[PDB]
């Protein structure tokens, strides 16, 4: 479905045919894959849209083949779609951190709570599972079962028919072991025909218990449909995140992610199995890559990334030490290369662990002391020297150089 993409990339990336007659087969195949992945259609043509707009105005950077630069846009774009920023802060803030699980029946609301509280235990916190799973008694059994199998306490008194009480009772008790994190799996009713039921039972819990985080589990089988419940969810609790489970037992995954994002919700994790370890933090970008191209996008990453005087000094010298292993460097300079056994002189320069003490002292300096250094004194000079590892001599040389250039450009 959506996995057929890397190939569509491994082709577009093997000088298959002419540049433009290739761009299209991709767009054909991308749309095919996306839609075939259950991503909403209006979104797909939309995307390809903002993709042809960029191929238009955006101008290709150096060391960027007509096509690689291309993918840089694809990736970027597929990337905005599924995420749009960096990995959320699955890391708790205040202690204790409290988490509620509002999973619609069949959504693995419970398996996830386990899988999740193991996530955190395994990462070093003192997790506590509160079984407010009222609408399901079988959830109780199965819960404490996997619970004991992982060394986690699970408060709960069956048939209380009132979870909000179970919550306050159970969370206020998990402040005893000074537990760091508390996972409150709130009962999820209305099976599949949910409507607005759980949202009400929710705004309630939030008001009564008032926890630090609220996460609505979604079955990755719901395709782009997930957009409705998700949207009502975000609306209800603009301060919460979605977890999408069973990602691996469907071909309509993309539809859910793209979907849930469409609304504005955040996807902190994604279930990928029945097992307990089957749950990993959702890294939007790494996902787009994981699908576009293994690391092919990686090379594209290096290349694009690294790429009145002491200022330019740093920015300048910095981009130079970075460099990058390739012969396209001279593609910038109006000169045609002749032989290659020569650059081995460059690998050798990088040989000495420490390549330049200049970027070292330039770092050991204030961002102002980098501007007007004629204020630098001998005390300031041994300070910046010892701080960098250099000697007052390696630094005097440095300073004299900035000015000789200060004077030289004056002489032009």
């Amino acid at each position: 479905g959506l996995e057929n993409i890397r190939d569509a990339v491994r082709k577009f990336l093997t000088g298959s045919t002419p540049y433009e007659k290739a761009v299209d087969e991709f767009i054909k195949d991308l749309q095919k894959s996306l839609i075939s992945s259950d991503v909403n259609v209006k979104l797909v043509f939309s995307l390809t849209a903002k993709i042809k707009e960029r191929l238009n105005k955006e101008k290709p950077p150096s060391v960027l083949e007509r096509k690689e630069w291309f993918i840089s846009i694809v990736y970027d774009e597929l990337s905005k779609l599924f995420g749009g920023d960096k990995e959320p802060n699955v890391n708790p803030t205040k202690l204790p951190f409290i988490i509620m699980l509002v999973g619609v029946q069949g959504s693995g609301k419970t398996t996830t709570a386990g899988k999740l509280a193991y996530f955190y235990k395994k990462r070093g916190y003192k997790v506590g599972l509160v079984a407010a799973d009222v609408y399901r008694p079988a959830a109780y059994d199965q819960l404490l079962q996997l619970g004991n199998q992982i060394g986690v306490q699970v408060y709960g008194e069956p048939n209380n028919q009132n979870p909000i009480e179970i919550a306050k009772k159970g969370v206020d008790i998990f402040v005893k072991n000074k537990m760091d994190i508390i996972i409150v799996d709130t009962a999820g009713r209305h099976g599949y025909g949910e409507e607005t039921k759980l949202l009400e039972e929710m705004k309630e819990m939030y008001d009564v218990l008032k926890p630090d985080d609220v996460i609505l589990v979604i079955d990755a089988s719901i395709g782009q449909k997930a957009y409705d419940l998700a949207s009502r969810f975000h609306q209800a609790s603009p301060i919460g995140s979605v977890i999408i489970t069973k990602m691996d037992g469907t071909a309509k995954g993309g539809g859910a992610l793209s979907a849930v994002v469409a609304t504005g919700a955040t996807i902190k994790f994604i279930g990928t199995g029945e097992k307990i370890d089957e749950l990993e933090t959702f890294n939007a970008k790494r996902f787009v890559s994981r699908i576009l191209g293994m690391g092919d996008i990686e090379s594209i990453l290096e290349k694009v990334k690294g790429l009145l005087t002491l200022r330019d000094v740093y920015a300048q010298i910095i981009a130079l030490r970075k460099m990058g292993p390739l012969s396209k460097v001279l593609q910038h300079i109006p000169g045609l290369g002749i032989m290659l056994p020569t650059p081995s002189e460059d690998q050798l320069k990088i040989g000495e662990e420490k390549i330049r003490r200049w970027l070292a002292a330039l770092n050991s300096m204030t961002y102002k002391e980098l501007e007007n250094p004629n204020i630098i004194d001998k005390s300031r000079m041994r300070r910046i020297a010892e701080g960098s590892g250099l000697e007052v001599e390696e630094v005097r040389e440095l300073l004299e150089w900035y000015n000789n250039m200060n004077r030289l450009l004056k002489m032009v």
Binding site: Q316, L320, E391, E394, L409
Partner: peptide, 20 residues
């Protein structure tokens, strides 16, 4: 552009002050 091919350029002329 040539500006740096001079500045970043004429540096090694006396890269001699270095330790041993």
């Amino acid at each position: 552009g040539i500006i740096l091919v001079l500045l970043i350029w004429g540096t090694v002329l006396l890269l001699k002050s270095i330790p041993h």
